[PDB]
Amino acid sequence: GSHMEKKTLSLCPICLKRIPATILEEDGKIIIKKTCPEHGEFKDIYWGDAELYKKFDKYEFIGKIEVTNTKVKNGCPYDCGLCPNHKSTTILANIDVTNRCNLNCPICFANANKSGKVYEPSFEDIKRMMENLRKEIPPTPAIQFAGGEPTVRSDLPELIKLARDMGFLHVQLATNGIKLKNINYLKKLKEAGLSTIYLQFDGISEKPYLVARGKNLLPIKQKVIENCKKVGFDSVVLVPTLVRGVNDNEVGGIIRYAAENVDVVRGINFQPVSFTGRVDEKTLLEGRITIPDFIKLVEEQTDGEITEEDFYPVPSVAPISVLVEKLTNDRKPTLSSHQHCGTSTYVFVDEDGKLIPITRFIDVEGFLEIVKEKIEEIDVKVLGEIALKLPSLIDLDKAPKSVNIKKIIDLILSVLKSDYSALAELHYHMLMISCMHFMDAYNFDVKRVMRCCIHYATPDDRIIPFCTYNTLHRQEVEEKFSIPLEEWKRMHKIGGED
Ligand SMILES: CCCCCCCCCCCCCCCC(=O)OC[C@H](COP(=O)(O)O)OC(=O)CCCCCCCCCCCCCCC
Ligand SMILES: C[C@H]1O[C@@H](n2cnc3c(N)ncnc32)[C@H](O)[C@@H]1O
Ligand code: MET
Ligand code: SF4
Ligand code: SF4
Ligand code: SF4
Ligand SMILES: [Fe+3]
Numbered sequence: 001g002s003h004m005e006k007k008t009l010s011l012c013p014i015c016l017k018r019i020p021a022t023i024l025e026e027d028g029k030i031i032i033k034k035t036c037p038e039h040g041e042f043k044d045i046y047w048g049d050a051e052l053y054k055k056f057d058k059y060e061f062i063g064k065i066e067v068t069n070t071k072v073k074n075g076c077p078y079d080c081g082l083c084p085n086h087k088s089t090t091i092l093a094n095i096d097v098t099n100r101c102n103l104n105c106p107i108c109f110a111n112a113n114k115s116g117k118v119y120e121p122s123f124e125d126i127k128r129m130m131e132n133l134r135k136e137i138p139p140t141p142a143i144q145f146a147g148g149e150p151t152v153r154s155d156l157p158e159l160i161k162l163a164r165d166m167g168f169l170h171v172q173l174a175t176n177g178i179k180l181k182n183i184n185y186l187k188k189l190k191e192a193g194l195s196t197i198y199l200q201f202d203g204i205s206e207k208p209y210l211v212a213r214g215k216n217l218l219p220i221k222q223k224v225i226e227n228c229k230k231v232g233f234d235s236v237v238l239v240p241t242l243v244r245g246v247n248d249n250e251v252g253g254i255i256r257y258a259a260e261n262v263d264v265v266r267g268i269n270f271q272p273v274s275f276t277g278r279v280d281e282k283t284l285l286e287g288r289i290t291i292p293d294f295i296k297l298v299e300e301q302t303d304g305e306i307t308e309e310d311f312y313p314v315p316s317v318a319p320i321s322v323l324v325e326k327l328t329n330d331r332k333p334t335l336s337s338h339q340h341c342g343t344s345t346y347v348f349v350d351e352d353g354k355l356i357p358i359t360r361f362i363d364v365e366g367f368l369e370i371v372k373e374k375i376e377e378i379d380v381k382v383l384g385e386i387a388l389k390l391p392s393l394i395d396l397d398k399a400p401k402s403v404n405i406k407k408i409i410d411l412i413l414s415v416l417k418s419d420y421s422a423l424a425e426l427h428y429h430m431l432m433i434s435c436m437h438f439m440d441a442y443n444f445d446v447k448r449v450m451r452c453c454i455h456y457a458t459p460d461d462r463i464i465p466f467c468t469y470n471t472l473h474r475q476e477v478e479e480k481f482s483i484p485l486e487e488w489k490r491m492h493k494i495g496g497e498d
Pocket of ligand 1: 313345346364424425
């Protein structure tokens with residue numbers, strides 16, 4: 001019948017206490033069982049496919065941190081953060097610049113617009129949160145403004161400039177895009193130096209928007225995309241909240257729409273719905289979907305152009321950072337998140353519009369093996385040796401006709417020389433297709449969250465993993481630093497200015 005895979009620690013979904021949990025294989029799926037001393041037994045889906053679950057375990061990578069912000073007191077996941085036992089530095093920081101929003105979505109992990117209180121850090125508070133992120137070893141390389149809807153603050157372009165001034169290589173905006181339907185507003189974001197728009201995007205028909213968002217936003221999303229084309233803003237990531245029964249049938253359609261718009265869309269990052277914050281009862285009961293379920297949908301709905309073997313877990317590229325760090329004697333941000341948190345592939349869009357994953361014609365598995373081997377052999381000769389082996393890893397038969405294989409190889413080598421511009425050019429050639437499954441109290445796994453690489457900087461000088469922030473800390477923090485809406489409105493204007 002069942003057989004145990006792992007022991008771990010989880011949370012009771014009722015009282016949020018830390019409780020023991022078992023991860024088990026059962027009928028081809030991975031389940032998590034747990035017991036609360038007070039509220040009894042719980043059973044949830046952890047991963048939809050036991051075979052892919054075991055396959056991803058081989059890419060486990062344990063990171064290290066040196067700069068901490070909190071002490072051990074109550075043990076994980078209560079000591080965030082970062083406490084001395086966290087195993088990853090910040091790769092992408094989140095700063096919530098507001099809890100106000102110009103929407104009222106039925107699915108909202110932040111439960112925006114319900115507290116009756118306004119959380120809006122000052123420009124100086126945000127600079128200090130950025131300093132804390134930049135004090136890490138290595139410094140946090142990427143930051144995203146979130147909330148809430150960040151575009152409802154009139155000072156957002158100044159915050160984007162500030163992030164650039166503070167040294168972040170990548171400045172991202174998570175947004176519902178509504179204000180970006182005005183092209184002059186989009187122009188000010190580009191001019192301020194925004195790297196990427198992380199655009200909420202739930203489908204290619206009206207129904208997923210009606211369900212998840214409460215109204216048909218599809219024409220507005222389309223306008224935002226057309227505005228990006230008009231102003232030459234070419235770095236949009238579409239972000240579907242993936243809900244079984246709502247838009248699991250539109251996975252291929254979203255991917256095809258991105259590929260049709262690959263001049264401005266650099267990726268789709270699917271987010272299987274996370275039962276934190278605000279969720280409607282049908283979503284809670286019927287909507288659960290996991291990373292391997294998503295991978296299966298991609299294969300089915302792109303007619304086998306993208307297959308299961310094309311996806312890798314995020315830490316599979318941790319050794320690339322390690323190697324680059326050793327080659328250059330400079331500490332590099334390392335993607336050391338848990339192997340069951342997320343997955344990605346990369347595809348080329350050819351002339352006919354067919355999707356050709358880079359893994360179809362580059363032996364990515366073999367490439368990562370050589371990388372891990374050369375780390376063990378660490379020097380002046382490594383790069384040349386790897387450059388010698390790269391042709392044996394390529395299948396020129398399966399490569400797209402519209403792709404210069406020699407240029408891709410050179411860009412890969414330049415990434416190994418710590419050329420960030422080559423990594424960015426590589427992303428411009430391709431369409432990233434990824435899926436990240438943020439935890440909730442039903443599937444919480446302490447062994448995952450200890451490796452989390454996506455962190456909120458808070459106004460009380462903490463740095464808190466995304467998955468503990470949205471299950472345990474968001475209300476506490478927002479309540480401390482909010483003022484009642486009644487008084488906030490009388491002291492400000494709608495953009496947040498005094
Ligand atoms: C509200 C909070 C929500 C937080 C959600 C987390 C989102 C995580 C980020 C998603 C990814 C966005 C990346 C930006 C893409 C882009 O525009 O890319 C284009 C940009 C170039 O833009 P600029 O030149 O303008 O700065 O380059 C980058 O952003 C470089 C960083 C790339 C990060 C690589 C991540 C690796 C993932 C693991 C790969 C596994 C192996 C795959 C094998 C085939
Ligand atoms: C930052 C992104 O997260 C999406 N989002 C909002 N609520 C949820 C949820 N419960 N689970 C997953 N993604 C969600 C938003 O729609 C936005 O695109
Ligand atoms: C909780 S979502 C925060 C970012 C923005 N409001 C969006 O929906 O894209
Ligand atoms: S998630 Fe990390 S920072 Fe938070 S308590 Fe656990 S180990 Fe510490
Ligand atoms: S999901 Fe984003 S846009 Fe929707 S209500 Fe929440 S914060 Fe606002
Ligand atoms: S944000 Fe959640 S899903 Fe992503 S790395 Fe952190 S723990 Fe894993
Ligand atoms: Fe309980």
